[PDB]
């Protein structure tokens, strides 16, 4: 009774991709399984890790020139995956899609740290300005007094 | 007078984080290096207890400013001194790295939705559905 629908694949993709990222990360960590969808992610994470150790270095460079930020990451991921399946779909290209999505995620995540530090820097500056901290420091001789 | 302190705060705080993580050709950068050495020592004794309080506070990138403001407000409500100011930098450094690290699973969830959203509208999920769904992936061998 019934058959695999699109939405059924979609809902499973969440659990599959989660397990894929968890075990991909786990293998990159040491290099320094309940549900059936979770096992599919583990099996794919094992395959994706072998494809990665072979072809990761070249994508590290290609990601540098792409310069994906948190803003255009979705834009770049969309048109890249579109060109991937334009001439057809197969399990191999699907596996490559997960490997690219995982790497593009971690890449944008790691390179976005300095951006987040700037926001926190504005939090510190914003607080000191209006809460008389800058007034106190300026009168105490400025920032040079710390030395 | 205040604005001069504000502008310098950006350069000082940058060098503070730069050397805290490490554990800079400017006079303000040297202030950050000096503060990073002291801030790291205080962080080696009382960090464990704040790890738990940060767990319950659950600061995210959205409400981080809101929580940082009233927390820092209560810090200086009873007065201001050089000691409390240094603690403010130590808290900002820890609050930054904490919200950043704990937001990874949050960022992965958003990326998970991009993939799912992509497969839905670009016939990828239908293609998988016709081959039997994701369970079919287990037949990849030889």
């Amino acid at each position: 009774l019934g058959s695999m629908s699109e939405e059924q694949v979609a809902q499973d993709t969440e659990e599959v991709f989660r397990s894929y990222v968890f075990y991909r990360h786990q293998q990159e960590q040491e290099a320094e399984p309940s549900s059936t969808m979770g096992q599919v992610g583990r099996q794919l994470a094992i395959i994706g890790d072998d494809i990665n150790r072979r072809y990761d270095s070249e994508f590290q460079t290609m990601l540098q020139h792409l310069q994906p930020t948190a803003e255009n990451a979705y834009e770049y991921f969309t048109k890249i995956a579109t060109s991937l399946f334009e001439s057809g779909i197969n399990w191999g290209r699907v596996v490559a899609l997960l490997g690219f999505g995982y790497r593009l995620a971690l890449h944008v995540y790691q390179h976005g740290l300095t951006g987040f530090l700037g926001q926190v820097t504005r939090f510190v500056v914003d607080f000191m300005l209006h809460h008389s901290i800058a007034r106190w420091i300026a009168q105490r001789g400025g920032w040079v007094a710390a030395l | 007078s205040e604005e001069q302190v504000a502008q310098d705060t950006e350069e000082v705080f940058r060098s503070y984080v730069f050397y805290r993580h490490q554990q800079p050709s400017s006079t303000m950068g040297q202030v950050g290096r000096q503060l990073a050495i002291i801030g790291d020592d205080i962080n080696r004794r009382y960090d464990s207890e704040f790890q738990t309080m940060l767990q319950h506070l659950q600061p995210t990138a959205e409400n981080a400013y809101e929580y940082f403001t009233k927390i820092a407000t209560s810090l200086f409500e009873s007065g201001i001194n050089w000691g409390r100011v240094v603690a403010l930098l130590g808290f900002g450094y820890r609050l930054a790295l904490h919200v950043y690290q704990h937001g990874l699973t949050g960022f992965l969830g958003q990326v998970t939705r991009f993939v799912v959203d992509f497969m839905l509208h670009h016939s990828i999920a239908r293609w998988i559905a016709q081959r039997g769904g994701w369970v079919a992936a287990l037949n990849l061998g030889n």
């Binding site: 070249e58 290609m62 990601l63 991937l84 197969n90 690219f100 | -």
Partner: peptide, 25 residues
């Protein structure tokens, strides 16, 4: 070339390579 095209060209090349040896007939 542009990174968008080279990346998609390599993913396609790597995926089809995987498919040609691990997608059973």
């Amino acid at each position: 070339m542009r990174p968008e095209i080279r990346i998609a060209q390599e993913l396609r090349r790597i995926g089809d390579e995987f498919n040609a040896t691990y997608a059973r007939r």
